[PDB]
Every structure is written in C-alpha cells, then in structure tokens.
Design an enzyme around this catalytic site. Sequence first.
Site, PDB file in Angstrom:
ATOM      1  N   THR A  38       0.821  -1.207   0.000  1.00  0.00           N
ATOM      2  CA  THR A  38       0.000   0.000   0.000  1.00  0.00           C
ATOM      3  C   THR A  38       0.858   1.262   0.000  1.00  0.00           C
ATOM      4  O   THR A  38       1.900   1.315   0.655  1.00  0.00           O
ATOM      5  CB  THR A  38      -1.018   0.011   1.174  1.00  0.00           C
ATOM      6  OG1 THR A  38      -1.592   1.321   1.302  1.00  0.00           O
ATOM      7  CG2 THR A  38      -0.335  -0.226   2.528  1.00  0.00           C
ATOM      8  N   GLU A  51      -4.952  -3.790   3.132  1.00  0.00           N
ATOM      9  CA  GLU A  51      -4.809  -4.537   4.371  1.00  0.00           C
ATOM     10  C   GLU A  51      -5.992  -5.456   4.686  1.00  0.00           C
ATOM     11  O   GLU A  51      -5.882  -6.316   5.568  1.00  0.00           O
ATOM     12  CB  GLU A  51      -4.611  -3.557   5.534  1.00  0.00           C
ATOM     13  CG  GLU A  51      -3.274  -2.829   5.528  1.00  0.00           C
ATOM     14  CD  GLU A  51      -3.348  -1.454   4.885  1.00  0.00           C
ATOM     15  OE1 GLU A  51      -2.652  -0.535   5.373  1.00  0.00           O
ATOM     16  OE2 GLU A  51      -4.092  -1.284   3.890  1.00  0.00           O
ATOM     17  N   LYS A  93      -5.793  11.335  -2.177  1.00  0.00           N
ATOM     18  CA  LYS A  93      -6.170  10.290  -3.120  1.00  0.00           C
ATOM     19  C   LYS A  93      -6.820  10.888  -4.364  1.00  0.00           C
ATOM     20  O   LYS A  93      -7.925  11.426  -4.303  1.00  0.00           O
ATOM     21  CB  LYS A  93      -7.083   9.248  -2.470  1.00  0.00           C
ATOM     22  CG  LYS A  93      -7.158   7.940  -3.248  1.00  0.00           C
ATOM     23  CD  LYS A  93      -7.866   6.857  -2.456  1.00  0.00           C
ATOM     24  CE  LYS A  93      -7.401   5.478  -2.903  1.00  0.00           C
ATOM     25  NZ  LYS A  93      -8.062   4.399  -2.130  1.00  0.00           N
ATOM     26  N   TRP A 148      -2.603   7.307  -4.647  1.00  0.00           N
ATOM     27  CA  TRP A 148      -2.162   8.093  -3.495  1.00  0.00           C
ATOM     28  C   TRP A 148      -1.040   9.077  -3.805  1.00  0.00           C
ATOM     29  O   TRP A 148      -0.150   8.798  -4.606  1.00  0.00           O
ATOM     30  CB  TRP A 148      -1.714   7.173  -2.356  1.00  0.00           C
ATOM     31  CG  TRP A 148      -2.806   6.329  -1.778  1.00  0.00           C
ATOM     32  CD1 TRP A 148      -3.049   5.011  -2.041  1.00  0.00           C
ATOM     33  CD2 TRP A 148      -3.802   6.738  -0.831  1.00  0.00           C
ATOM     34  NE1 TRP A 148      -4.136   4.575  -1.319  1.00  0.00           N
ATOM     35  CE2 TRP A 148      -4.619   5.613  -0.568  1.00  0.00           C
ATOM     36  CE3 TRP A 148      -4.089   7.943  -0.171  1.00  0.00           C
ATOM     37  CZ2 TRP A 148      -5.698   5.656   0.322  1.00  0.00           C
ATOM     38  CZ3 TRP A 148      -5.167   7.986   0.716  1.00  0.00           C
ATOM     39  CH2 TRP A 148      -5.956   6.849   0.952  1.00  0.00           C
TER      40      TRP A 148
HETATM   41  N1  LIG Z   1     -15.986   3.442  -0.154  1.00  0.00           N
HETATM   42  C1  LIG Z   1     -15.066   4.287   0.362  1.00  0.00           C
HETATM   43  N2  LIG Z   1     -15.445   5.460   0.888  1.00  0.00           N
HETATM   44  C2  LIG Z   1     -14.534   6.313   1.398  1.00  0.00           C
HETATM   45  N3  LIG Z   1     -13.221   6.014   1.403  1.00  0.00           N
HETATM   46  C3  LIG Z   1     -12.796   4.844   0.901  1.00  0.00           C
HETATM   47  C4  LIG Z   1     -13.709   3.942   0.361  1.00  0.00           C
HETATM   48  N4  LIG Z   1     -13.004   2.849  -0.074  1.00  0.00           N
HETATM   49  C5  LIG Z   1     -11.696   3.076   0.187  1.00  0.00           C
HETATM   50  N5  LIG Z   1     -11.601   4.278   0.772  1.00  0.00           N
HETATM   51  C6  LIG Z   1     -10.348   4.898   1.211  1.00  0.00           C
HETATM   52  O1  LIG Z   1      -9.230   4.235   0.557  1.00  0.00           O
HETATM   53  C7  LIG Z   1      -8.375   3.633   1.537  1.00  0.00           C
HETATM   54  C8  LIG Z   1      -7.867   2.294   1.066  1.00  0.00           C
HETATM   55  O2  LIG Z   1      -7.017   2.524  -0.053  1.00  0.00           O
HETATM   56  P1  LIG Z   1      -6.121   1.368  -0.659  1.00  0.00           P
HETATM   57  O3  LIG Z   1      -5.411   0.599   0.526  1.00  0.00           O
HETATM   58  O4  LIG Z   1      -5.090   2.009  -1.553  1.00  0.00           O
HETATM   59  O5  LIG Z   1      -7.029   0.350  -1.468  1.00  0.00           O
HETATM   60  P2  LIG Z   1      -7.420   0.539  -2.994  1.00  0.00           P
HETATM   61  O6  LIG Z   1      -7.780   1.981  -3.224  1.00  0.00           O
HETATM   62  O7  LIG Z   1      -8.664  -0.383  -3.279  1.00  0.00           O
HETATM   63  N6  LIG Z   1      -6.162   0.102  -3.993  1.00  0.00           N
HETATM   64  P3  LIG Z   1      -4.916  -0.814  -3.377  1.00  0.00           P
HETATM   65  O8  LIG Z   1      -3.868   0.073  -2.749  1.00  0.00           O
HETATM   66  O9  LIG Z   1      -4.242  -1.657  -4.437  1.00  0.00           O
HETATM   67  O10 LIG Z   1      -5.471  -1.720  -2.299  1.00  0.00           O
HETATM   68  C9  LIG Z   1      -9.236   3.474   2.794  1.00  0.00           C
HETATM   69  O11 LIG Z   1      -8.423   3.513   3.962  1.00  0.00           O
HETATM   70  C10 LIG Z   1     -10.186   4.674   2.717  1.00  0.00           C
HETATM   71  O12 LIG Z   1      -9.539   5.829   3.246  1.00  0.00           O
HETATM   72 MG   LIG Z   2      -4.093   1.069   2.653  1.00  0.00          MG
END
Ligand SMILES: Nc1ncnc2c1ncn2[C@@H]1O[C@H](COP(=O)(O)OP(=O)(O)NP(=O)(O)O)[C@@H](O)[C@H]1O
Ligand SMILES: [Mg+2]
Lengths: 491, 507
Positions: free
Chosen positions: A177, A321, A432, A437
């Site tokens: 991440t 995670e 984001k 990110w």
């Molecule tokens: N439905 C949602 N609404 C608001 N915030 C969200 C939502 N889904 C994810 N997030 C934000 O995105 C974060 C997770 O990002 P991330 O770990 O990068 O997963 P991802 O965006 O699906 N891509 P990846 O990094 O490969 O797992 C969370 O901690 C939230 O802050």
């Molecule tokens: Mg994360």
Amino acid sequence: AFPSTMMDEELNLWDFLERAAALFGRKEVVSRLHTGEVHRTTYAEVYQRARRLMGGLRALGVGVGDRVATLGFNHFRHLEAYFAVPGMGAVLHTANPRLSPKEIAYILNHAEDKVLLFDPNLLPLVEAIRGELKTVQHFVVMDEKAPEGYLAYEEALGEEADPVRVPERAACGMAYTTGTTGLPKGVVYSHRALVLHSLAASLVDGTALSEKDVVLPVVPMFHVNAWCLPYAATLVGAKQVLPGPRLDPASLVELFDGEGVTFTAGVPTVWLALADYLESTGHRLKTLRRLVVGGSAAPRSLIARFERMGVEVRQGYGLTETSPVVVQNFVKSHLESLSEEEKLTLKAKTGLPIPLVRLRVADEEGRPVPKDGKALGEVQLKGPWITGGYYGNEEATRSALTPDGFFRTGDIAVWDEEGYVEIKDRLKDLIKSGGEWISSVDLENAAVVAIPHPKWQERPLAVVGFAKWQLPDAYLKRALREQYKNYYGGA
Amino acid sequence: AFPSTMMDEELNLWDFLERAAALFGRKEVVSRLHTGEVHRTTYAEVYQRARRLMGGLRALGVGVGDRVATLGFNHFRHLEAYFAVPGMGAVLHTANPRLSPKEIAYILNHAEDKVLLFDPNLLPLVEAIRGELKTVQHFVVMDEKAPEGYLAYEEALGEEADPVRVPERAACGMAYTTGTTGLPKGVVYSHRALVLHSLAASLVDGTALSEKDVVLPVVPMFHVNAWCLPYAATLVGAKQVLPGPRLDPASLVELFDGEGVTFTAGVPTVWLALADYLESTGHRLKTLRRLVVGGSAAPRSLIARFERMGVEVRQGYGLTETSPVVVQNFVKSHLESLSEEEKLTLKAKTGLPIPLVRLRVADEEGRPVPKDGKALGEVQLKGPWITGGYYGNEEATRSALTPDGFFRTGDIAVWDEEGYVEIKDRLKDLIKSGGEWISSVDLENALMGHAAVVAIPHPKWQERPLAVNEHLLKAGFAKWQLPDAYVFGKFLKRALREQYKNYYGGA
Ligand SMILES: Nc1ncnc2c1ncn2[C@@H]1O[C@H](COP(=O)(O)OP(=O)(O)NP(=O)(O)O)[C@@H](O)[C@H]1O
Ligand SMILES: [Mg+2]
Ligand SMILES: Nc1ncnc2c1ncn2[C@@H]1O[C@H](COP(=O)(O)OP(=O)(O)NP(=O)(O)O)[C@@H](O)[C@H]1O
Ligand SMILES: [Mg+2]
C-alpha cells in the site's frame, strides 16, 4: 475436548478454477488488449494454460513460498497468473505500474521477487528499473513475443503440472500500500483469507455474483487483486470481460453492450466519466444492471445519476490490508419505505459491515463511540481476511493494532443505530486522486492539503522525483482545508 | 512457510447471531408453538436470552466439549439453543423424537449427553425413556413451566454470559443417522464446517438468502440442523418463521401469508400435501417465491405444480454426514433457451455440485464413470463439511471411505457433460418413507423369526415397504414402519422391485 468427524480439507484458490473448468468450462473470458484487439478464451483453456504456467514457472526456478510479481492490467494472461502462482504454492505479488520507477524498484526488491510478468506496453518502465532490481532472475513479457534478454509468456509456458497443496493459512499473494506515510508497506494474503472473502462478499446483499452474470472489473488487477473479483467470478462460473488499460467511456460501452455485461466495479472517477458520456449521447446500457463503486467515497450525485439510468449502485469499502472488502452498501428491507431523498442519502453512506468482519468505530483507547451518526472515531477491524501486521516492518506492525488486537484503518467515521458506516475523514495526511495516493509531506519537503475535486476526488494544493499527475494543480491543517474547501469548485 | 500477515481469527457460529443482534436486531423470529399459539421475538432478544442460556447451562455443569441434547421442533427456544450451546464451546446434539424409544435412549447414552432440552408435548416419550438414560443429569422442558422432577427452560436461564471461542475445527454439534444398517451412527460437525456451509450454500445459485427474505424451514431442526437454514438465515439477518410440530397445509398457509414468507424448504411429502391443499381450495400464496425440496427426490409433477403457481422450485441433495448440502439444482444460463418440457426435466435432476465440494460418480475402484448420463456409479465426496468418519465406530469409519479418502454416500447416480447429477438408486438397503428411514433387514430378519422387504414407489410418501403385523410390532416397530402389503445367501431385490413397481399405485 470434543473432536469433530469433519474432514480436514484445506481451502485453496486453485479449487475455484478447477471447479470452473469442470462445470463451466465453455464460459468465456474476454480480453481487450492494449492495441484494442479483442481476445476470446474459456475457463477450460485458462485452466489448461494455467497448469502449463505452473510447469513453466517451476522450470524457471519458482518453488513454494517464492514471490512471482506482475505489472499489468486486466486480461486473460493476468487471470492465468492469478491461479497458477497460488496454485503451485507460490506468492502472487501484484505490483502497481502507475507508481514511480523508484517506488516499484523498492517494492520488488523488498518482496524479493524471483520472476516478473509484465505487459508489453510497460517495457520502457521495466527497462528503466531493470538495473535497480536485485532479485528478479527472469523477466516475462505477457505476449506472444519478447525482445532480446526478455522471455515471452507463450514461450515460458511448459508442460502441464498438478497443483501443489499447502495449509490454507500459507501465503498465496501480496500487495504493498502507498496510502501511508514513508515507505510502501507489504500485506501478505493467504488462501484461507481470499477464499473466505470471495464467499462472504458475493452474497445477495453483497455483489450477488451468479453463473449467469457477466462480470467486468474496471478496478485494476493490481488494486487488492481487483477487489478479489476475478476469484469470485471464477468461483460462480460467471463470464468475465477484462477491459485492459483502455478505460475511456466509449471503450467500456463497447464492451458493456457487445459482451452483455451485467455487473461491473470500479473507482468513482471512471464512473463519473462514464455517466458524463451516457448522458451526453443519450445512450442507455442494454444489459448493465449492477455497479459497485469503491476506493473512494461515491458522491451522492454519482449514485443518483446511474439510478436514474436504471443502474443499481452499491458502495464498497476496504483497504489493501483487508483483502479488501469489509463494508458493502445495501438498503435494509424495512428502510425501503423511506422517501427517494432519504434512500439516496442512505445509498450514499459507506454501508454495512459484511459477514465474518468485526467492525467498530472507536476512540483512542479502543472505546466505541455512540451510534448517533454524529460522534467521530476510527474504523477498527478484526477478521480472518484482515491483516494483523505488515511484512518486514516492525514499526508499522506495532502501530497497526490496538491493545485488544483490532486493526487501525486510519479512517475517521460515524455510525448509526441501523449499523450504517459513513467515512467522513482520514487520520492519515494523504491525497487520493483518481484512486491513486499522493503524499503531502514528500511534495512539501522538496504545506500541501487535499482539496475536493469534481472529476478526481481530491487534488494537491501547495502553500507559499514526482510524476505529472502528482503535481499540485495550484499554489495545523484543519483550517486550510475548510478555508480552501471550494478552490477547485466541486459542489 | 513464507508467513501470511492475515489475522488468525477462528470461524465461530456465535458470530452470526452477534452480527444479527447488532445490525438486524429488530428483525423478527416468529414461532408457532405446539398449542397453535404464535410467539413473537427478535434477533436482539434471542441474542440476549442465548447469553442467559450459556450462563444457565454453565451453572448446570456444562463445560467445553460437553453434549447438550434437544428433542424438539422449530421454535425460538430451539434457535436460542442453536447458538448458546456452540457459543459456550459445548456440543449441540439434535435428536430425532420420531425414532423408537430404544433408538433415542441409545443415541443419548452413546453421545453421553449431560442435559436434555425437550418440547412439552414430548413429555410422555421422555418419561418412558428416563430410566434407560445413564448420563443425562438435567431434564429441561422448552416452555415456561415444568412438572415435578423437571426444570422449566425459563427457570434454567441464568446470568448473561460472554461466549467462549474454541478452535474452529472443534465440535459445535452432532447428529445420528438412521439411514444405515444396525444401530444409528453419529456425525460430529465443527464450527468451521457449518460456517462454510452457510456461506457456500446461500449464494445466488443456491438458496440466495437475503436480509429481505422471510425464511420458513419446514425441515425439522433435528434433520441435519434443519439443513443449516436457521444458521444461514441468521447470517443474512432474514426474518425467521418457525412452524413447530404443526406441518399440516392449513397451518402453514396461515404462516406463509400472515408473515409474508418468501423462502421455504422441506421434504416432498409436505409439499405434496400443500399442493393438494392449494389446488383443492383455489387458495394462492401471496408472497412465496422460492421453495427448496430435499431429503428425497422431487417428482417431476411436484415441480411443475408449484412452478405453475409462480413458485421457483430448486432441488437440494445431502446427508446427515455432509452437513448436509453438497448438490443444488439451478438452470445454467445457456440452458435457459431450452423448451418448457426440457427445463422441467432438468429441474427434476438432482443438480450441480456446490462450491467447496469435490463430487465424483465413481465405480468400485474409485474411478469416475462416463459422463453420458447413463453409466451408474456411487456418489463420493470430499470437502471441509463432509464427514471423514463416525463417532466411536472404527468399522463404520473405514467402510465409509475410499483408499484415496472420499466419503462413500451409498447413493447410485448418473452424471452428464454439463455436470448435473441424478440420483437413481441406493446401495444401502433401506426404505425412506416421508423423510424417515425403515430398515428392510430389521423387518425381514424379524419376520423370518415366525421374507423379502423392498422399497416401492408411493404417491404420498416417497417409498413404502412391500413384504414378499403383530409379530413386527412386538419386535419393536411403530405403526408407520409396518409394510402396507404382503405378497406370497442374499435376496435378489432388483427383480421384486421391478415386478411390483406399481403395486402401491403411482410411482
Ligand atoms: N468506499 C469508500 N469510501 C470512502 N473512502 C474509501 C472507500 N473505499 C476506500 N476508501 C479509502 O481508501 C483507503 C484504502 O485505499 P487502498 O489501501 O489504496 O485500497 P485501494 O484503493 O482499493 N487500492 P490498493 O492500494 O491496491 O489496495 C481506505 O483507507 C479509505 O480511506
Ligand atoms: Mg491502505
Ligand atoms: N434430493 C435428493 N434426491 C434423491 N435422494 C436424496 C435427496 N436428498 C437426500 N436423498 C437421500 O437421502 C439420504 C440422506 O438421508 P439423511 O442422512 O437422513 O439426510 P436427511 O433426511 O436430509 N436429514 P435427517 O433426517 O436428519 O437424517 C441420501 O443418502 C439420499 O439417498
Ligand atoms: Mg445418512
């Protein structure tokens, strides 16, 4: 004290494709490659070729526990790797090609990947970082052909091999991440975690995946394994349409109608562009019924747009995670009587915690905050597909958990009496943009705040190494955010 | 072992109820008691009372691994026991009250049950077997009041206790099968098995259970834990309607309409009585959308009758040994273009193997038979909710497994290229009448003490014994077990079965 008589049968990801080949072998996997050409294969052929990939990778020196990395978009060869690597007891490391060359080199070196599979259009990036890589012994281009010093995927395939059996808690995959301060942090999934996740997230109140569905993951296969969708679609025997790198509205619409897509999932930015296009052309999708949105908060308007066009929108929430799904939005039966405005507000909420997940919204000492939809706390999680720490990072590991063993997401939220969660803020000082990110700090030491944006969802604004998309658009923090709340003018 | 970073959290059945209380706490659990009265409670209340039941059972001396038995029908108190017993790390032994007093006393003694919970209307049965029981210390009537020498369920409830977590592979419950030769054989389920079963069986291509569903299990809570439906319904937070002992059509229709039932599951005999009722009265169900038929083969005409009324009919197959679901019927997308007649025929097939189940139709050496829908073989299974043997019986354990570790069901089937299974016959020599087992041997060997007993197709029941009365009743048989007709070194049975195929008029 009392043993059961149940068989000690391990959960394994390979069992999804094995069942797909036996019961739904003629069901199609359709891919649009980087050139725009459309490739057609089936579960029976993917299974055959995945067995060949297992034998090929063994000939390349891959054993149980070894890491095999991918740098690619959604297509059939990536799907074959999704099963072959965990199938031989190895670890599928999905790496993000949109990151900086320095970040990719660090992650591949930290994971100590033995083999790298990558898309042809990503050769310049691989050639750029190749000299920095210290563990990669074989570079495989996911194509028919490869240049000098590189191996072609079709050449790399060997004799069919039987799958290797491992305890379900053994590693099947890993992802780093970038939604954190400092260095990327590695999360290692297990067969057990991803099998349970596939089952629990695919119920009627979740994605409701069926054999009759046609599934199009717009979420990249390098974002938490495309939110586990390629695994869950295989489990039910659904037809899969893999769009590749082309995520422009016209390309997606072509696949939506041409292949009869019923279910899709992606980040808000892609869906806003899609809705813009459908509204401007007056085109209504002929088979699409269900759409999930995740990665960032879906605007109330985004949900209203598609519901107006006859598309059901269900919000999903999770992290690298957490595999990733821990929260999914659906309307409770007794809340169907709510007015259209109230229902839209409910759909715009993050959603309800899914089966096999223990979720709480709590304070600094782990105490749950009141369920009044007003009190703010941190989302904290426990379950079999939620990480208990990070790979090769002791300081990140000990700061990840609460004293009572709950994982700390870093997300601030409210929850109500009905059990609905609403992500309102973030403890972590990050931006984001379009599902990717940006670190505020790294741009600073070289004040940067996240400002709401219509199209993407946050954009950097500086106050007076990096890629062009990371660049701040224009030139104590809880003040500058609320002050410049409408600099980029987004509702 | 390159270590995964995933949390080492166990699967536990209690988590279903804890989630139901937190998210769907106001959702109703409706029960019809043995007197005909309708009781109303909620998941939040069931949750609170199940915590009190854990505290109460502990005070009675129930510890981790101990067996708590039930002898009752579908109602809220049985549902509370379904969670409280496994929730405290104990073992819920669901016993069948339709069995002989000798059979019930045997299984209760074999399992070494410490506490017995039973329905007030089954008091005469319990009183009749009480002297035979060697391990039962406390007798609890599932009611507000109890006679002398008995404890009332409401009295038995204690202080609210927190659940105990056990390794997921440890026992949560057990049940004995009478579909075997000799004495009943015990199967012990684990938390892991039933949690996985509830998930995999409830997918869209399965029972498709949802929060919006109103679930009515006609299958008894002593028939493989009512096919795991009370657990799966709690998992999704669906409204539950529990009919009790009154399974007559009029009583069910009241609940179907009055409670807005969307999903139901039971045996063919009950659904044949319902179809007869609805057709003869002209009454049409207003909310029922889905119906599953299991335990015995659903006749082609039974499916057509309900589909004619707008009710989707999905066949399910399993055993006491398999938790029970391993096979479910649904029409594949590309076969939706088949004619009405062809689709009805496909629906009459047993169905497709479900996720996390390895099914084969194999010969004597364990080799798969051709997938032409003609070649006969035995259904053999492997998976996380399939039994690897029997409790306290080595002989039965080793005779139930193939060299390569597959469980032998005793069912003869064919399978086709599409993967559809059709149960055609049985290796085991028994009669299944209205969902309950009759041993042909126990009937033969008794009779010859003064014969060949075979299963013959029946319209109402699904099979009835034909022998090729007072003597049989004395040897320890009930009225329902008695062969309907008599016609004047093993027995060549296939011939007698084919000759008298239509003796009980109607296949
Ligand atoms: N439905 C949602 N609404 C608001 N915030 C969200 C939502 N889904 C994810 N997030 C934000 O995105 C974060 C997770 O990002 P991330 O770990 O990068 O997963 P991802 O965006 O699906 N891509 P990846 O990094 O490969 O797992 C969370 O901690 C939230 O802050
Ligand atoms: Mg994360
Ligand atoms: N759908 C079906 N079609 C044909 N035969 C079936 C079907 N379902 C079950 N059976 C038969 O019934 C046997 C299982 O009986 P059993 O172990 O008693 O399960 P059950 O009747 O569902 N529950 P219980 O009454 O508590 O034991 C199988 O071995 C099959 O022979
Ligand atoms: Mg049985």
